[PDB]
Design a protein around this ligand. Sequence first.
Ligand code: TTP
Ligand code: MG
Ligand code: MG
Length: 377
Amino acid sequence: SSRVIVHVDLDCFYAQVEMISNPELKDKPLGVQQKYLVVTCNYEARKLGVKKLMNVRDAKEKCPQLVLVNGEDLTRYREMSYKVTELLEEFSPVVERLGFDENFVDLTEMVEKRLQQLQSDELSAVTVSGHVYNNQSINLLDVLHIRLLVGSQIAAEMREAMYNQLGLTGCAGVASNKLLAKLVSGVFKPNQQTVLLPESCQHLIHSLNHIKEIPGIGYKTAKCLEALGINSVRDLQTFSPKILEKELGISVAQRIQKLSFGEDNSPVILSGPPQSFSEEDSFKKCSSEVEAKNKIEELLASLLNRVCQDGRKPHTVRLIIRRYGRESRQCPIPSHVIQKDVMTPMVDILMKLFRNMVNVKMPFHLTLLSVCFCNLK
DNA sequence: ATGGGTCCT
DNA sequence: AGGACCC
Ligand SMILES: Cc1cn([C@H]2C[C@H](O)[C@@H](COP(=O)(O)OP(=O)(O)OP(=O)(O)O)O2)c(=O)[nH]c1=O
Ligand SMILES: [Mg+2]
Ligand SMILES: [Mg+2]
């Protein structure tokens, strides 16, 4: 009801992982490269004009000193990612992952247990750790301010444990819901944290300049909104609910308009172990079924290596292509395959899936291949 | 875009 | 299967 949520966001995650592995890159401008893309870079490269998801040409022209490491193989980032979520689950077991480098934790039971243990004089007494959003004055007689401040202390303990046990730096935002925790975690970067008091909530949401900056409003929704003349957070706040419902549907319209007021009642959900494992490769051109099979075989072998080490097994396989969005075909994995030479029965499954989507007697042009193990039991 | 993930329809 | 969203 009245919650205290923390959002944890690792600093330049892949680059942090690469710098830890090779402390020779730690003092140097660093970009993590995938194909032609600099997906992320350290804060030294960001100074020199390098931005995330920048073209490798644009980056090294903007920064000739820029060291590049290849981050196509996600193995090590994925491993570090789970170490961070496991560490946070020791604080409170209900930790929600968002991608590889973000976690939400509902701190509210932890805050209340800590509060129960303090005396009268000990409230006097309670102090923030890190920044207060908008430099708002704390009122220690306001129980909501008190609970949020205890939230900030837990957030700092979390960041200190991540640093002490894992070597990782990150930001945290503490607020009354997920939306606001996530929006506030980014106010001071890198390696800082911020707490949002209730009175400054409107200030945070109106500080955004693009409607797409709201988590939950993506590329297609934003473009839709733009067509409707909705550009600021206030435009969306004040736009006719009826016209919005008609344009985007009851569900999207009501959720995002709620989000435009800073309102978000979604619970922090326990992510637990993953729902799926997948491996992807992208390329300029694939036009031969023989090469496609070879491609699919490599993706398989990596997937089987992961299958596997978590211990539990997938009950369905999916193959995703991109021609020239995506197309896919899935089917169950036979139970005699599941109990785990698996490779040779597995590839024929995938090629049958391939040939259903791709008429191989007719010239084709693929730019992506992806195998997914899902429906784990 | 890359190389992943999520849940809903 | 596809389509939104998130990183
Ligand atoms: C958005 C995005 C992220 N990523 C990866 C690279 C990032 O290191 C990791 C976390 O993403 P982000 O948190 O968005 O970025 P970051 O941790 O690199 O930098 P920041 O300090 O601003 O938080 O996810 C992709 O590979 N492709 C993408 O499109
Ligand atoms: Mg970020
Ligand atoms: Mg990050």
